[PDB]
């Protein structure tokens, strides 16, 4: 079975007061870490019932869950929705017990058993990371002059199109190229949002040796994280019920640890 | 009985003066750590 969970954030109100929930969404790494803190081990929960001990990733279960962040929901109020799809039951009352300021509504969870027959029309929403891997010559310095270096870099960069092609056509072709393998066939696809997603990651770096021995003194260095994001919505038709269920709960692209793979399907 | 005489010695020319060589007032220990010392920043970075 699948577990589907929904979280709500205000992202509104008085701008002259602290808003930890709205500020929490400025870094995708922080969002991923906070969502990962919702799956504690059976020993950590017994030892620390209040989540008041130092946080170590080795004490939390590893499981490839997926999530997406949606915005602009109305009713005279602003809302940001976080939708999480997982293969395990989340523990929201352990993750947000000391951070109830973050949310504007209690978390909700439910079961999900999608059974689809062959040749069924579905309405889908999903966000992609438009990335391709290429060999790039290394240009450096640019101190008024460009100096080339002989090394060729294997780098994952953004998807590009020609001057006579619209981004929508390029993305539709790029998705229809792989849609045979995933297990569905498109009928219409339109691009809604195209942009970037940013984040920062801490990394330990050694500085000096310990006089008493047994380790170093260490410090933190921050590494940037940039991704190309494109949101799509449209209609699809199931080819075979076997590969489609594998496409779900797995992702349809890269950067799946930063909310970049999730298929949302409605029966039309 | 015995006979006894009295004399004098003026300090600074025939008798010298020694230093304190010690501490009299006890006083408590030292609070108020420094936020600009390099060791404090090093240990703060390590703790982080």
UniProtKB/TrEMBL annotation, chain A:
Its EC number is 3.1.-.-. Keywords: Hydrolase. The keyword Hydrolase applies. It comes from the Bacteria. It is an enzyme of class 3 (hydrolase). This is CRISPR-associated endoribonuclease Cse3. The gene is cse3.
Automatic annotation (TrEMBL), chain B:
The lineage of its organism: Bacteria, Pseudomonadati, Candidatus Cloacimonadota. This is CRISPR system Cascade subunit CasD. The chain holds residues 244 to 291 of 388 of the full protein.
């Amino acid at each position: 079975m699948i577990y589907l969970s929904r979280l709500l954030i205000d992202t509104g109100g008085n701008p002259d007061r602290p808003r930890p929930g709205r500020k929490w969404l400025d870094n995708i790494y922080n969002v991923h870490r906070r969502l990962s803190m919702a799956f504690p081990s059976g020993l950590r929960r017994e030892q620390d019932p209040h989540f008041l001990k130092p946080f170590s990733p080795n004490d939390f279960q590893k499981t490839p869950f997926l999530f997406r962040v949606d915005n602009n929901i109305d009713g005279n109020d602003k809302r940001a929705i976080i939708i999480v799809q997982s293969v395990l039951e989340p523990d929201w009352d352990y993750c947000f017990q000391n951070a109830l300021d973050f949310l504007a509504a209690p978390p909700e969870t439910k079961e999900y058993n999608p059974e689809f027959k062959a040749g069924q029309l579905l309405r889908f929403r999903l966000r992609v990371n438009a990335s391709v891997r290429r060999h790039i010559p290394e240009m450096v310095q640019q101190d008024g002059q460009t100096i080339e270096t002989g090394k060729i870099l294997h780098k994952r960069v953004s998807l590009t199109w020609d001057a006579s092609s619209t981004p929508d056509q390029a993305l539709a072709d790029w998705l229809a190229a792989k849609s045979p393998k995933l297990g569905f066939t498109l009928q219409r696809c339109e691009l809604l949002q195209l942009g970037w997603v940013y984040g920062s990651k801490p990394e330990p770096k050694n500085v000096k040796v310990k006089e008493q021995g047994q380790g170093y003194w260490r410090e933190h260095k921050y590494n940037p994280l940039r991704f190309r994001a494109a949101l799509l919505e449209g209609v699809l038709e199931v080819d075979d019920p076997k590969l489609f269920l594998k496409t779900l709960s797995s992702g349809i692209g890269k950067a799946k640890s930063f909310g970049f793979g999730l298929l949302s399907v409605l029966p039309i | 009985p015995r006979f006894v005489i009295r004399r004098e010695l003026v300090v600074g020319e025939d008798v010298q003066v020694s230093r304190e060589t010690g501490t009299s007032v006890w006083r408590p220990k030292g609070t108020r750590a420094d936020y600009n010392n390099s060791e404090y920043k090093k240990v703060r970075a390590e703790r982080l």
